[PDB]
Amino acid sequence: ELAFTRPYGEQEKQILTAEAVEFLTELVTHFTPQRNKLLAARIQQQQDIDNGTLPDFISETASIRDADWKIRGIPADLEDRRVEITGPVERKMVINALNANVKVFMADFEDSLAPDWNKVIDGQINLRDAVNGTISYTNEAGKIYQLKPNPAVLICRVRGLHLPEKHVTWRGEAIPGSLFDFALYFFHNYQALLAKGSGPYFYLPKTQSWQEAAWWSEVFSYAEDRFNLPRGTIKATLLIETLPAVFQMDEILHALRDHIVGLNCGRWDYIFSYIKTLKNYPDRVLPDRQAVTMDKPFLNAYSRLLIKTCHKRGAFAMGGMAAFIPSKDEEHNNQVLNKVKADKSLEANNGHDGTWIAHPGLADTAMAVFNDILGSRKNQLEVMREQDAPITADQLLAPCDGERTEEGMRANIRVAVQYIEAWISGNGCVPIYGLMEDAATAEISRTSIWQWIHHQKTLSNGKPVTKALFRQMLGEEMKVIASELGEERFSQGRFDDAARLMEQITTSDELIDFLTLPGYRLLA
Ligand SMILES: O=C([O-])C(=O)[O-]
Ligand SMILES: [Mg+2]
Ligand SMILES: [Mg+2]
């Protein structure tokens, strides 16, 4: 049986109904052991890379890659996804996102949410109310927020396979957060979603292998069968946002063929994963974060391969997001929108079927680019990129050299520390220096600093990057943060705890896989 570590309040009584908990228990008991074996398999596969065998395509599955076959199908309401907005599962946010000038809202339990128990439960309440069409919110000023006609299509992003949900245990251990988030969104909403001609749709993050995709396929099939739904009722879009996964896109599509409708270039997790996965290769060190842009060869190759591979199988190839926040200053906002427009134009011209935004102020820009290139069509499924030569492992793994600067290092410290401080305080997405920071973008910043220390890289000013240099810069940059935020905000925050965690993970000889793992220990 499952144990719940917190007493039920009114919200738990809504979400954790006896029937919901029975269903969750079935998924946990049927699928948790296999999930743990998958996490163990990751260790061995990384060790093989660490020991000198770089990633490449899989030998034995060549027949799958060179065969003609397609995914099972795409629901009518997922035929046009030219712009999707992402946002966390907070109540007002859900309403504003569903009302935005977009096709889809991806409600997030993952990288943009700090997974406090109350926020995960409230998130399930909010999405149920949203599916049911009744969600409403009135703020302090007495302004009421409700869904407008024709709200966006809803897709739920669950926590990744590594994340525990520690407030529910089974056999003395936290259950998988992935199963918690999936089970409850599916269970509470499948009936209403299906009744209105939609379905239970998910975004699946941080996949590393086709076997992980196969596990999801088993989870989905079990869920469908439990409630006597037709096969392929549950539809997933799967982020290719780890370096191992870019070599297994066709195998992933095949393993999830009954449920999958698309892959997505999760560029920020992908860059983070490039650093983590190639941590033991001194020639694969990435430069200042702002220099790692989608026009760089390795990233352009990743996108073009994803586009060709998805379209070969009749699946969508979704783009990602640039992470620039609109400005309240008009002149400055013009510059922001011009760079967002440029980023989207690259995606649309390459053949992506749609793109992401994380702020409604970007919707008109993103929609205009996609409206222009799509014309009378709903997507770009027909774009096969036959002009492209084969894309090879050497191309996907190519170094990407650039300046490693003191300013870049200090910025990474400031970003990582401030992100950790927000996250441990319950805020998983925060604006910093005109950029939207969530777990993946902060992960790049902290992992980059570790990488420069690990390989004893020099900064462009000749300064050797060391644990000592980092520790001094950490204290110095904390003073900068205090000065920027003011005495009240800084003193009332958790910057002491954040700096401590940052120092621990940064000066460890081993690279921790995710900052969210030790970070979770600071959550109630
Ligand atoms: O998921 C994302 O947004 C990413 O990793 O880029
Ligand atoms: Mg609408
Ligand atoms: Mg991601």
Q: DSSP label at 143? A: -
Name residue, tokens 């039920």: 8
440 lines ligand 1 (CB under 6 A): yes
Distance 454 CA to ligand 1 centre (A): 25
| Rounded Cα distance, 392 and 56, in Å | 8
Distance 185 CA to ligand 3 centre (A): 20
Residues 128 and 252 in one domain: yes
Choice from 293, 356, 436, 437 to test ligand 1 binding pocket (greatest atom count within 8 A of CB) = 356
All residues at 6 or more sequence positions from 191 whose CB lies less than 8 Å from its CB, including other chains: none
Q: DSSP label at 203? A: E
Q: Which whole-number Å values give the CA distances from 99 to 82, 104, 136, 137, 327, in the listed order?
A: 16, 10, 12, 13, 21
Q: DSSP label at 448? A: H
Residues 425 and 390 in one domain: no
321 lines ligand 1 (CB under 6 A): yes
The ligand 1 atom nearest the CA atom of 269: 5
User: What phi, psi does 269 have (nearest 5°)?
Assistant: -60, -35
At 478, the amino acid letter reads M
| H or E, element range at 169 | strand 164-170
Residues 459 and 410 in one domain: yes
Q: Token pair for residue 233?
A: 């009722």
Sheet of 355-357: strand order equals 316-318, 260-265, 235-240, 201-204, 153-157, 104-108, 83-88, 355-357
All residues at 6 or more sequence positions from 363 whose CB lies less than 8 Å from its CB, including other chains: 83, 85, 100, 101, 102, 357
Choice from 104, 110, 111 to test ligand 1 binding pocket (greatest atom count within 8 A of CB) = 111
Q: DSSP label at 435? A: E
Residues 237 and 318 in one domain: yes
| Rounded Cα distance, 430 and 428, in Å | 7
- CA count, 13 A, side-chain hemisphere, 13: 4
91 noted as active-site residue: no
**Domain of residue 53, residue span:** 1-402
- CA count, 13 A, side-chain hemisphere, 292: 27
Residues 209 and 190 in one domain: yes
User: What phi, psi does 242 have (nearest 5°)?
Assistant: -135, 150
All residues at 6 or more sequence positions from 25 whose CB lies less than 8 Å from its CB, including other chains: 1, 2, 170
Q: Which whole-number Å values give the CA distances from 135 to 89, 108, 125, 193, in the listed order?
A: 12, 17, 9, 15
Q: Ligand 1: which residue has its CA nearest to atom 3?
A: 266
Residues 137 and 223 in one domain: yes
Distance 171 CA to ligand 3 centre (A): 30
User: What phi, psi does 165 have (nearest 5°)?
Assistant: -110, 100
- Work out the burial of residue 250: count CB atoms within 10 Å of its CB; fewer than 13 is exposed, 13-18 middle, 19 or more buried: buried
All residues at 6 or more sequence positions from 212 whose CB lies less than 8 Å from its CB, including other chains: 38, 161
Q: Token pair for residue 499?
A: 């700096």
268 lines ligand 1 (CB under 6 A): yes
User: Where is the domain boundary, 385, 402, 419?
Assistant: 402
| Rounded Cα distance, 335 and 345, in Å | 15
| H or E, element range at 187 | helix 177-195
User: Where is the domain boundary, 371, 402, 433?
Assistant: 402
320 lines ligand 1 (CB under 6 A): yes
DSSP letter for each residue of 323-347: -BPP-SSHHHHHHHHHHHHHHHHHH
274 lines ligand 1 (CB under 6 A): no
All residues at 6 or more sequence positions from 55 whose CB lies less than 8 Å from its CB, including other chains: 49, 243, 244, 246, 247, 277, 393, 396, 397
519 lines ligand 1 (CB under 6 A): no
Distance 126 CA to ligand 2 centre (A): 17
User: Residue 441 sits in a domain of what CATH number?
Assistant: 1.20.1220.12
157 noted as active-site residue: yes
Q: Which whole-number Å values give the CA distances from 353 to 228, 316, 347, 445, 483, in the listed order?
A: 32, 6, 9, 29, 44
The Cβ of residue 497 has, within 10 Å, a number of other Cβ atoms equal to 15
| Rounded Cα distance, 266 and 119, in Å | 24
The Cβ of residue 425 has, within 10 Å, a number of other Cβ atoms equal to 19
Residues 418 and 352 in one domain: no
Q: Which whole-number Å values give the CA distances from 112 to 12, 126, 437, in the listed order?
A: 22, 16, 8
Residues 453 and 396 in one domain: no
Domains: count for the chain: 2
Choice from 155, 267, 276 to test ligand 1 binding pocket (greatest atom count within 8 A of CB) = 267
Which residue in 290, 297, 242, 293 sits closest to 264, CA to CA? 242
Q: Ligand 1: which residue has its CA nearest to atom 4?
A: 266
Q: Which whole-number Å values give the CA distances from 309 to 249, 349, 394, 398, 429, in the listed order?
A: 7, 16, 18, 20, 31
At 106, the amino acid letter reads M
77 lines ligand 1 (CB under 6 A): no
Catalytic member of 81, 157, 313, 404: 157
Residues 232 and 177 in one domain: yes
Q: Which ligand is nearest to the CA of 151?
A: 2
Which residue in 512, 514, 325 sits closest to 437, CA to CA? 325
110 lines ligand 1 (CB under 6 A): no
At 211, the amino acid letter reads Q
- Work out the burial of residue 175: count CB atoms within 10 Å of its CB; fewer than 13 is exposed, 13-18 middle, 19 or more buried: buried
The ligand 1 atom nearest the CA atom of 111: 1
Residues 442 and 387 in one domain: no
User: Where is the domain boundary, 382, 402, 422?
Assistant: 402
Residues 213 and 268 in one domain: yes
| Rounded Cα distance, 280 and 50, in Å | 6
265 lines ligand 1 (CB under 6 A): no
Catalytic member of 289, 313, 438, 446: 438
Answer whether 164's CB lies under 8 Å from 222's CB: no
Residues 432 and 481 in one domain: yes
DSSP letter for each residue of 63-108: HHHTS----S---GGGS--SEEEEEES-HHHHHHHHTSSSSEEEEE
Answer whether 85's CB lies under 8 Å from 106's CB: yes
| Rounded Cα distance, 128 and 188, in Å | 7
User: Residue 371 sits in a domain of what CATH number?
Assistant: 3.20.20.360
